[PDB]
Amino acid sequence: MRLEKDRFSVNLDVKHFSPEELKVKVLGDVIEVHGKHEERQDEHGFISREFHRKYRIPADVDPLTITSSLSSDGVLTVNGPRKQVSGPERTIPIT
Amino acid sequence: MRLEKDRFSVNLDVKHFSPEELKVKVLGDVIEVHGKHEERQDEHGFISREFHRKYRIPADVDPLTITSSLSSDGVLTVNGPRKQVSGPERTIPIT
């Protein structure tokens, strides 16, 4: 949902939502994310919002190392580091 | 320049260009690419095309393992594999 020269961040507005109702997850290359709230006809134009978003990590981002926080105003945040890594400037053979 | 569910491919039209004149390269996360042709005023609307494109590899693609070929019709192709990898479907702690 967002990238930086040193870190990254996925942001989702899911206001009036609460953690027990959501599922974050890391399946290697991907970042799973499931939601589902049944506040029911209580609202007005009732909303039974459920889903399942998935994102692709970036290469220099470790599949582990993920701060998955949240703010008071119902906003899922997913964090992680970047690594410049070291490969000798590898001159590639063009056929 | 292009992606697939199992492999990837970067394609550049650089017709009337020849390998000695170009530089492919892998700097960890990135794929460098330099060009420069001086066919000179020989053409008509002379063209002194030089540059330096750079691409970001995808996570499941090894920084090594890169078939950099080319076709007869002046087209740089850059290839590589993908790996589903294995991480236990890692349930992430949302704060």
Swiss-Prot record, chains A, B:
Its main location: cytoplasm. Changing R53G: In MFM2; decreased interactions with wild-type CRYAA and CRYAB but increased interactions with wild-type CRYBB2 and CRYGC; cytoplasmic aggregation. Zn(2+) 2 binds at H37, E39. One of its GO terms (biological process) is stress-activated MAPK cascade. Zn(2+) 1 binds at H16, H44, H52. GO terms for cellular component: actin filament bundle; axon; cardiac myofibril; cell surface; cytoplasm; cytosol; dendritic spine; extracellular exosome. The modification N6-acetyllysine is found at K25. Changing D42G: Found in patients with restrictive cardiomyopathy; likely pathogenic; reduces CRYAB and DES localization at the Z-bands and the intercalated disk in the myocardium; cytoplasmic aggregations of CRYAB and DES. Keywords: Acetylation, Cardiomyopathy, Cataract, Chaperone, Cytoplasm, Disease variant, Eye lens protein, Glycoprotein, Lysosome, Metal-binding, Myofibrillar myopathy, Nucleus, Oxidation, Phosphoprotein, Secreted, Zinc. It is found in: Cytoplasm; Nucleus; Secreted; Lysosome. The record marks M1 as: Susceptible to oxidation. Residues 1-95 form the sHSP domain. GO terms for molecular function: amyloid-beta binding; identical protein binding; metal ion binding; microtubule binding; protein homodimerization activity; protein-containing complex binding; structural constituent of eye lens; structural molecule activity. Lens as well as other tissues. Expressed in myocardial tissue. Belongs to the small heat shock protein (HSP20) family. May contribute to the transparency and refractive index of the lens. Has chaperone-like activity, preventing aggregation of various proteins under a wide range of stress conditions. In lens epithelial cells, stabilizes the ATP6V1A protein, preventing its degradation by the proteasome. Heteromer composed of three CRYAA and one CRYAB subunits. Aggregates with homologous proteins, including the small heat shock protein HSPB1, to form large heteromeric complexes. Inter-subunit bridging via zinc ions enhances stability, which is crucial as there is no protein turn over in the lens. Interacts with HSPBAP1 and TTN/titin. Interacts with TMEM109; in the cellular response to DNA damage. Interacts with DES; binds rapidly during early stages of DES filament assembly and a reduced binding seen in the later stages. It is linked to Myopathy, myofibrillar, 2: A form of myofibrillar myopathy, a group of chronic neuromuscular disorders characterized at ultrastructural level by disintegration of the sarcomeric Z disk and myofibrils, and replacement of the normal myofibrillar markings by small dense granules, or larger hyaline masses, or amorphous material. MFM2 is characterized by weakness of the proximal and distal limb muscles, weakness of the neck, velopharynx and trunk muscles, hypertrophic cardiomyopathy, and cataract in a subset of patients. Cataract 16, multiple types: An opacification of the crystalline lens of the eye that frequently results in visual impairment or blindness. Opacities vary in morphology, are often confined to a portion of the lens, and may be static or progressive. In general, the more posteriorly located and dense an opacity, the greater the impact on visual function. CTRCT16 includes posterior polar cataract, among others. Posterior polar cataract is a subcapsular opacity, usually disk-shaped, located at the back of the lens. This is Alpha-crystallin B chain. It comes from Homo sapiens. The lineage of its organism: Eukaryota, Metazoa, Chordata, Craniata, Vertebrata. The chain holds residues 68 to 162 of 175 of the full protein.
